[PDB]
Amino acid sequence: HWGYGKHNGPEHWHKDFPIAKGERQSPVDIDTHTAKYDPSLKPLSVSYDQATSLRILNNGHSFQVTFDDSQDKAVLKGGPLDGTYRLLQFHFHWGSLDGQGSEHTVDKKKYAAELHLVHWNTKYGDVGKAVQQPDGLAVLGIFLKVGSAKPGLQKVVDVLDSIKTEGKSADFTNFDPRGLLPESLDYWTYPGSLTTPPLAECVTWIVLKEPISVSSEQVLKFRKLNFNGEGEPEELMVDNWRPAQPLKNRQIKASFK
């Protein structure tokens, strides 16, 4: 039922998910001048050398690449985190035009898209249990700007024609998520939520300062996907982003000066 349209979009979500108006919702505007440099923050540890991608799926809200999270193969640790977080999946949010699409904003600037690498804390054993905990998930967010192509994204965009509509999926092995990362691991961090229903307040957000560049042709392939199932009226999967939510009683910390 929920989606991104006029009648079922983000302003409606609180009716099914009342935490939508809670105290630690995501995304937020990152006011770069108000973020506090915290010299006690550690460098982020991203260990993706043994990542095993499995499948790529159109879920009717975005597309996602799912990983084998049954062992510690692709993990996030360090930064603001305590313990080890396993990579479950990545997905994107994007716009109908290049001036919107990101969920987080930086001094009110919207990027063309935002990549989310979703990880869960191994202390809770499974993602279902982790979503019920205030430190259950760590999501690494990366902004996409339009310019030069990202070579490491191309394997992903080339299979999107095979998952056009909601419910389609395909085998998607040997995809290396290291090829989606920018040079710097400088980050902002704050406590927040899932940006899609159920909007659970379980996420340590880690948002990279450095965007990656993708080409117009790459982002145009995102915009050919459909929210609808095959046999329903065609509704392009664009503008699948939640807008910035109130910061309330939170401080955004920066790993860098």
Ligand X SMILES: [N]S(=O)(=O)[C][C][C][C][C]C123[B@]45[B@]67[B@@]89[C@@]1%10B81%11B698B746B814B562B%10%1143
Phi then psi for residue 87, to 5 deg, are -70, 120
Q: How far is the CB of 92 from Zn ion (least distance, A)?
A: 8
Q: What is the DSSP letter of 15?
A: G
Residue among 41 and 200 whose Cβ is closer to ligand X: 200
Four-residue CA torsion sign, 219, 223, 227, 231: negative
Question: Active site includes 61?
Answer: yes
104 contributes a contact to ligand X by CB under 6 A: no
Q: What, of ligand X, Zn ion, none, does residue 118 touch, CB below 5 to 8 Å by kind? A: ligand X
Q: Which residue is nearest to ligand X (CB)?
A: 116
Q: How far is the CB of 181 from Zn ion (least distance, A)?
A: 17
Single out the residue of 115, 138, 139, 156 in contact with ligand X (rule: CB under 6 A): 139
Q: Which of residues 152-211 bind ligand X (CB under 6 A)?
A: 194-196
Cβ atoms of 116 and 92 within 8 Å: the answer is: yes
Residue 91 is assigned to a ligand binding site: yes
What is the per-residue binding string for Zn ion in 110-149, x denoting contact by CB under 5 A?
Answer: ------x---------------------------------
Number of neighbouring beta carbons within 10 Å of residue 242: 23
Tokens at 35, concatenated = 């973020």
Residue type (1 letter), 7: H
Tokens at 51, concatenated = 């990542």
Q: Which residue is nearest to Zn ion (CB)?
A: 116
The residues with which 249 forms a beta bridge, in sequence order, are none
Q: How far is the CB of 116 from ligand X (least distance, A)?
A: 4
Residue 196 is assigned to a ligand binding site: yes
Residue 116 is assigned to a ligand binding site: yes
Q: Which of residues 116-135 bind ligand X (CB under 6 A)?
A: 116, 118, 127, 131
Residue 93 is assigned to a ligand binding site: yes
- In the set 7, 61, 104, 119, the catalytic residue is 61
Q: What, of ligand X, Zn ion, none, does residue 127 touch, CB below 5 to 8 Å by kind? A: ligand X
For residue 125, how far is the Cα from the chain centroid?
21
Strands (E), the chain: 29-30, 36-37, 44-47, 53-58, 63-67, 75-78, 85-94, 105-106, 113-121, 137-146, 169-171, 187-192, 203-208, 212-214, 253-254
Using alpha carbons only, how large is the chain's radius of gyration in Å?
Answer: 17
Residues with catalytic function: 61
The binding site for ligand X (CB under 6 A) comprises 116, 118, 127, 131, 139, 194-196
Question: Which residues participate in the annotated binding site?
Answer: 91, 93, 116, 195-196
The binding site for Zn ion (CB under 5 A) comprises 116
